[PDB]
Amino acid sequence: SGKIKISTPYNLTKRMMMPMLNGFMSQYPEINIELTTESNADQLDPTEWDVIFRVGPQRSLIARKIGSVKDILVASPEYVNAHPMPTHAEDLHDHFLLKGHPLLKWTLINSKGETVVNVDRGRFQANALNVVRSASSEGLGITLMPDVMIKEYIADGSLVRILPDWSANPRDIYMLYNHKDHLPEKVRLFIDYVIAY
Amino acid sequence: KIKISTPYNLTKRMMMPMLNGFMSQYPEINIELTTEPTEWDVIFRVGPQRDSSLIARKIGSVKDILVASPEYVNAHPMPTHAEDLHDHFLLKGHPLLKWTLINSKGETVVNVDRGRFQANALNVVRSASSEGLGITLMPDVMIKEYIADGSLVRILPDWSANPRDIYMLYNHPEKVRLFIDYVIAY
Numbered sequence: 001s002g003k004i005k006i007s008t009p010y011n012l013t014k015r016m017m018m019p020m021l022n023g024f025m026s027q028y029p030e031i032n033i034e035l036t037t038e039s040n041a042d043q044l045d046p047t048e049w050d051v052i053f054r055v056g057p058q059r060s061l062i063a064r065k066i067g068s069v070k071d072i073l074v075a076s077p078e079y080v081n082a083h084p085m086p087t088h089a090e091d092l093h094d095h096f097l098l099k100g101h102p103l104l105k106w107t108l109i110n111s112k113g114e115t116v117v118n119v120d121r122g123r124f125q126a127n128a129l130n131v132v133r134s135a136s137s138e139g140l141g142i143t144l145m146p147d148v149m150i151k152e153y154i155a156d157g158s159l160v161r162i163l164p165d166w167s168a169n170p171r172d173i174y175m176l177y178n179h180k181d182h183l184p185e186k187v188r189l190f191i192d193y194v195i196a197y
Numbered sequence: 198k199i200k201i202s203t204p205y206n207l208t209k210r211m212m213m214p215m216l217n218g219f220m221s222q223y224p225e226i227n228i229e230l231t232t233e234p235t236e237w238d239v240i241f242r243v244g245p246q247r248d249s250s251l252i253a254r255k256i257g258s259v260k261d262i263l264v265a266s267p268e269y270v271n272a273h274p275m276p277t278h279a280e281d282l283h284d285h286f287l288l289k290g291h292p293l294l295k296w297t298l299i300n301s302k303g304e305t306v307v308n309v310d311r312g313r314f315q316a317n318a319l320n321v322v323r324s325a326s327s328e329g330l331g332i333t334l335m336p337d338v339m340i341k342e343y344i345a346d347g348s349l350v351r352i353l354p355d356w357s358a359n360p361r362d363i364y365m366l367y368n369h370p371e372k373v374r375l376f377i378d379y380v381i382a383y
Contacts, residue, residue, distance in 0.1 A: 002311065013321055022328040025313060029286070035316040096224075121198070124220060127231040128205075134213045140220055 003032040004187055007044060007052040010037045010101070011129035012173070015148050016067060017053060024193050031186055039101060039127060050187045052176040055102070061176040066194060069146040071103065071168035074159040076139030089116035089166045096141030097122040100132040106144050108166045116166070144168065198227040199373050203241045205232040206290070206319040207363070210338045211257065212241060215383045219376055226372050238373045240366040243292070253364040256380055259336045261293060261358035264349045268329030279306035279356045286331030287312040290322035296334045298356040306356070323349075334358065 008017055013035070025033060038044065041054040046061050057063065075085075086092060089108050099106070099122040106118040123141045126132055133150060136143040137158060153159045180188055203212045212230075220226060234240060234248060246253045276285060279298045289296075289312040296308040314325050319335055326333040327343065332352055343349040365380055367373070 003315075013318075014324055018321060018324045021314075022325050022330065025325065025330060026328065029313070031313075032311055033314045035314070035321060037316070037318055037321070121227060123224070123227055125227075125229050128208075131208060131213060131230065131232065134209070135217060135220075138217045138221060140217065 003034050004050045004190060005048070006033060006035050007038055007041065007049050007054070008035055009041075009053060009055050009173070010039050010127075012055070012069065012146065012148060013037055014130075016069075016173070020194060020197055024190065027193070028189065031190070046176060046178055050177065050183065051191060054174050054176060055171050057174070058176055061178060064175050064195070065172045066175055066197065068170050068172045069148050070170045071144050071146055072150070072154075073108075073142060073144050073162050073166065074136060074150055074154060075142045075162055076137055077157060077160055078139035079136070079141070080160060080162065082139070085162055087163075089118075089163055092116075092118050092142065093120070098132040098135045098141040098143040099125045100129040100143070100145070101127040103129070103144055106168070108144075108163075108168060110165050110167075146171075198229055199376055200236070200238045201228060201230045201241070202237045202239075203230060203232050204243055204292075205317075206292075206339065207243070207259065207336065208232050209320070211363070215380060218383070219379050222379070223372075223375070226376070234366070235368075238367065238370075239376065242364050242366055243361050245362070245364055246366050250368065251366040252369045253366050254377075254381060255362050256365050256383075257363040258360045259338060259363065260360045261334050261336050262340070263298070263332055263334055263352040263356060264323075264326060264340055264344065265332045265352050266327055266329040267347065267350050269331070270350055270352070272329070275352065279304075279308070279353060282306075282308050282332065283310060288314045288322045288325050288331045288333045290315065290319040290333075291317045293319070293334050293358075297358060298334075298353075299359060301355045 086095060097120055109115045124132060124135045129145060129149060132143050133145060150159060154161060175194060177191060220228060234251060276282060287310055299305045313331055316322050319339060322333055323335055327348055340349055344351060367377055
């Protein structure tokens, strides 16, 4: 066509998928990108998109890992200064929790194999993550959020890591497409530029 | 729990500071929020209601302007008229895939060209605009941050979109009414 059709995860687009595209379009001023942000990539099929970025497997298509994220628990310094903070991950029931898609079910694990699972009704639940980060900045509860999204917020004192020995199983970002012999030349150069990262 | 829908792009700068203040005043209220009419208790929307079932309250307004980076304007001849936007690079994000710019003297221009970068969101389109990759059309609220500190410059200072309004839709309980009273007062 006269464009390439991308799919991209909802929350991690701005920080991990943009420097790659903002350097790609700067290398090819003749290519047009159309980006779409999705919540459930399980309802997508591959022939309607050139390449598909996604967190998780595909349940056919090429599946390559470009990066990964690990999820941390954070709250505002205003929030920790207002209550005695939890020392064991099961004390999360006695706190305000801010959940966001796709992390509505917190699965945490410490050292030597203890797993805690939290499936609650948080004080503020949403389908995006950048918006519950805005909630924990004011200090209205605790949030589990990927490393890449808050790495600047936490590094300034705007948010602090709590329960530092409790982490989440990492999730990896996968890029999907059909066999290269079935896609135009414009799609190939984008694919290999991503792998060049 | 109150169930609320909001437009994606305007949520960061408008819905949140008001939403965050409400839960800060009502800890007993749980809020579920999805960013994009009976499966919702309160719906924030661009444009007037399309259903006599709802009662709307205009709570704000938004006007869009043309922006680029100083790296872009100092590397290209900045255009003089909105018709010159074809000889330039354009970045477009929903719901502004087409630009209906008007001038002070009344001239109206429509641009429906395919941009170098197109997305269903605007935060990601501005991200490409901060890299000096073309000219954008973005709401004033979403860019007072970057304009007022040299990240983005304004292009064609008298060409702009015309104000779309922000309406609050609801169905004329307890918790849902106070939040309605809260936003009116905000």
